[PDB]
């Protein structure tokens, strides 16, 4: 479907646009896709960007008739240096398959159940292992803990929907009970491919200050979490100004951890000011940094 | 090999092969070679899963004639030598 | 080039100037059953004549 991919490209561009003007600029040169796509660990937002692709464009006129087939691509998003980025839909198995795999997997378990019965034995968990995540109910469930409780749940889907009516916030995954359904996708390989495909950890850090904290050793760094401090600042008595302005810190650690890109001297346009008594030049006013 | 990272067959790699062949034949030869590689030599290194990706995966070049069919014949059925 | 919303391959691009082309009846005149594709009709035709 053209327009959906179209909406992807738009929307994602619009979000990066948000983070961008979150400081002040749209300039593409400041924001190489490392910035937005490095996993949180390295200090990036880690947003999973499936925009890019290349988007079949052909000659709409007839494509209101024939399905003329792809004659051209329109570059969905861009870069400055390109590389690429792996995009999700490559890491997600399509439905047809998984229903096929499901069908067979549960056939095998039909047999192995018949044996382990007839032999009056109890399961190998190996005989089951290769199939561990295969199957649409996802065999793991059979052996999840609480089963002889959850036998007495029924009709979970509908409830998982009419929650539409019964509560305020979104719950964007209704369509599954991860208890009944197993878990229908895993990713992490994504993280790996975005990490290296950016040019490897050794380049990615060339953007940061990581040669300014004097660590010669990288991987020994866990960061640290400021998340915990959340309860003990206060609970109520912040006036609204202190709730927001006391919410603008966890940005301003990030935009420091990539400083030397965000401030950089191939900037397209800006009027240079050295800071007051320092030796640093800033290109344009960027208030946070 | 990426196809074998992928935990199941996917139509993707089949249409990739096909639209690569019909661009030029040097790719055609390159394939039939690789079929030699994998079947003859390199089967020994694959677990009884990945055959689930392969067997179909050549199934789709061979049904539709991109292989072409008779290049199968190089494959043999013997207790003599078959893995 | 502009006013018809084309781009000569080496050309300056401009704006639709008559933006909404999307209104259309479902109408048999120019349809496919009735039209024969022999020669493509590149743009530069449409900018030439």
């Amino acid at each position: 479907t053209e327009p959906l991919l179209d909406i992807l490209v738009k929307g994602e561009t619009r979000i990066q646009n948000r983070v961008k003007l979150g400081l002040n600029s749209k300039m593409p040169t400041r924001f190489p896709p490392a910035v937005f796509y490095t996993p949180k660990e390295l200090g990036g937002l880690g947003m999973i960007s499936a925009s890019h692709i290349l988007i079949p464009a052909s000659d709409l006129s007839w494509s209101k008739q024939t399905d003329t087939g792809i004659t051209h691509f329109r570059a969905g998003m861009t870069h400055e240096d390109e590389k690429l980025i792996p995009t999700i839909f490559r890491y997600i198995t399509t439905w047809e398959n998984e229903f096929l795999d499901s069908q067979r997997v549960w056939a095998e378990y039909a047999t192995k159940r018949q044996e382990a019965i007839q032999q009056n034995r109890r399961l190998a968990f190996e005989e089951l292992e290769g199939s561990w995540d295969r199957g649409i109910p996802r065999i793991s469930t059979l052996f999840q803990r609480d089963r002889h409780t959850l036998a007495y749940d029924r009709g979970h889907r509908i409830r998982r929907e009419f929650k539409q009516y019964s509560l305020e916030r979104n719950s964007p995954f209704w369509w599954t009970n991860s208890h009944h359904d197993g878990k229908l996708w895993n990713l992490n390989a994504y993280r790996t491919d975005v990490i290296q495909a950016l040019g490897g950890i050794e380049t990615i850090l060339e953007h940061t200050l990581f040669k300014g904290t004097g660590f010669n050793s990288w991987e020994g760094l866990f960061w640290e979490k400021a998340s915990g401090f959340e309860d003990s600042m206060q609970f109520k008595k912040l006036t609204h100004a202190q709730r927001t302005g006391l919410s603008q810190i966890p940005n301003r650690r990030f935009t420091l951890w990539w400083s030397p890109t965000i401030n950089r001297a191939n900037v397209y346009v800006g009027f240079l000011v050295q800071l007051d008594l320092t030796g640093i030049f800033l290109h344009g006013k960027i208030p946070t940094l | 090999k990426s196809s074998l990272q992928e935990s199941t067959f996917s139509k993707f790699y089949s249409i990739l092969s096909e639209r690569m062949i019909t661009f030029h034949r040097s790719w055609q030869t390159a394939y039939n070679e690789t079929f030699e590689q994998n079947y003859t030599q390199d089967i020994e290194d694959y677990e009884t899963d990945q055959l689930r990706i392969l067997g179909k995966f050549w199934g789709h070049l061979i049904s539709y004639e991109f292989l072409p069919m008779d290049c199968l014949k190089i494959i043999k059925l013997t207790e003599e030598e078959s893995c | 080039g502009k006013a018809l919303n084309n781009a000569i391959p080496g050309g300056p691009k401009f704006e639709p100037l008559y933006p909404r082309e999307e209104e259309e009846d479902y109408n048999e005149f120019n349809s496919i059953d009735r039209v024969i594709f022999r020669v493509p009709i590149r743009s530069e035709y449409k900018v030439a004549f």
Partner: peptide, 27 residues
């Protein structure tokens, strides 16, 4: 040879507008 493939323009659709021949599908 903008033939009718492509966009009216990339102003709002956020791409670069670039359209290239597709090597894949000819036959």
């Amino acid at each position: 040879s903008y033939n009718g493939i492509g966009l009216k323009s990339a102003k709002g659709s956020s791409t670069s507008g670039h359209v290239q021949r597709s090597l894949a599908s000819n036959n």
